[PDB]
Design an enzyme around this catalytic site. Structure first.
Site, PDB file in Angstrom:
ATOM      1  N   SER A 294      -0.763  15.590 -11.978  1.00  0.00           N
ATOM      2  CA  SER A 294      -1.008  15.232 -13.362  1.00  0.00           C
ATOM      3  C   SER A 294      -1.258  16.495 -14.170  1.00  0.00           C
ATOM      4  O   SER A 294      -1.794  17.482 -13.668  1.00  0.00           O
ATOM      5  CB  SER A 294      -2.213  14.290 -13.440  1.00  0.00           C
ATOM      6  OG  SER A 294      -2.621  14.047 -14.767  1.00  0.00           O
TER       7      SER A 294
ATOM      8  N   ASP B  97       0.836  -1.197   0.000  1.00  0.00           N
ATOM      9  CA  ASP B  97       0.000   0.000   0.000  1.00  0.00           C
ATOM     10  C   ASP B  97       0.873   1.249   0.000  1.00  0.00           C
ATOM     11  O   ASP B  97       1.359   1.668   1.055  1.00  0.00           O
ATOM     12  CB  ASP B  97      -0.893  -0.023   1.228  1.00  0.00           C
ATOM     13  CG  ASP B  97      -1.806   1.172   1.309  1.00  0.00           C
ATOM     14  OD1 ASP B  97      -1.922   1.901   0.310  1.00  0.00           O
ATOM     15  OD2 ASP B  97      -2.415   1.377   2.381  1.00  0.00           O
TER      16      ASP B  97
END
Length: 330
Positions: A199, A35
């Protein structure tokens, strides 16, 4: 040193991926959920409340000649999905894919929430976010990667998750045969303890690319892609009959639909998520309403590039003094 381990989807939907981890001496192999959005290595154990164990493999520290109680140390964690676990702490030898760390904090669960009990395939979590998020008290502990870093050939790990198939976690090297083209690296903020990046935009299907900054985290422990409501609405508007269902808890779509791809930007590069990766199947057995793999982050407080996005790429988690992320197509 290096390590390399195969990671395997737990079910036919790729809801999560499990990777075998050797703990203790002799080794006890547990299948952990790696994770990158958390920083605790915790396991089902011989200390876990018996009624909260249902098929998981447990770590028994009393059977490990290298286990040592970390005196006074406790842990307690709550995840973004509302699940939680807590317990005490041992140090022990932990190996992943041939890479060994001695003295790793292994957090033994005394209590786990129902969603963990109900998932017999996941024996615990191995956190790969920054150690500043580790929950051990009163002495915070380091992640497996942080402990291994100095010994690794290069201070990196890579995630290469499969679509409906196994993939690979590598530590200490970048397998140049595992991706196409070049890796585009992008800046990371560690201020919230995550692999947080920005992004450069998105496209829906064959549509034009929208240049827009989208801050979010690279999180292998989250199944889906959670993005701003504007972006998510633009995606699902291209699927006839798709709608947000408050009762189901997100966007659903007719199972008869063919889904468009979704592209996200990494610098000037582009990662394309095929439409099929966005199908999470019937909302309940036999239903013709299917659950979408792109969902709104509006109720979370952060955008999350979970497995839906990451499995479309070869992803480099560069833990150099100034961390960065790399993405390549594959």
């Amino acid at each position: 040193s290096t390590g390399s381990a195969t990671t395997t989807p737990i079910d036919s939907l790729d809801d999560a991926y499990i990777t075998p981890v050797q703990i203790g001496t002799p080794a006890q192999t547990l299948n952990l959920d790696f994770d990158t959005g958390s920083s605790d290595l915790w396991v089902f154990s011989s200390e876990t409340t018996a009624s909260e164990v249902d098929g998981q493999t447990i770590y028994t520290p009393s059977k490990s000649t290298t286990a040592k109680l970390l005196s006074g140390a406790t842990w307690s964690i709550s995840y973004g999905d509302g699940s939680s676990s807590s317990g005490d702490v041992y140090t022990d030898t932990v190996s992943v894919g041939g890479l060994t760390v001695t003295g790793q904090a292994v957090e033994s669960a005394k209590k786990v929430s129902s969603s963990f009990t109900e998932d017999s395939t996941i024996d615990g979590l191995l956190g790969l976010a920054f150690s500043t998020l580790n929950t051990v008290s009163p002495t915070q502990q380091k992640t497996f990667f942080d402990n291994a870093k100095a010994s690794l050939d290069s201070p990196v790990f890579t995630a290469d998750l499969g679509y409906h198939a196994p993939g690979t976690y590598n530590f200490g090297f970048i397998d140049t045969t595992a991706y196409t083209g070049s890796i585009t690296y992008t800046a990371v903020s560690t201020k919230q303890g995550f692999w947080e990046w920005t992004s450069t935009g998105y496209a829906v299907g064959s549509g034009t690319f929208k240049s827009t900054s989208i801050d979010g985290i690279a999180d292998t422990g989250t199944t889906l892609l959670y993005l701003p409501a504007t972006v998510v609405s633009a995606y699902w508007a291209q699927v006839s009959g798709a709608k947000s269902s408050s009762s189901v808890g997100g966007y659903v779509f007719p199972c008869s639909a063919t889904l468009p791809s979704f592209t996200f930007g990494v610098g000037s590069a582009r990662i394309v998520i095929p439409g099929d990766y966005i199908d999470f199947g019937p909302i309940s057995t036999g239903s013709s309403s299917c659950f979408g793999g792109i969902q709104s982050s509006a109720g979370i407080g952060i955008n999350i590039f979970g497995d839906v996005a990451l499995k479309a790429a070869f992803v480099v988690f560069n833990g150099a003094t100034t961390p960065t992320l790399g993405f390549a197509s594959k």
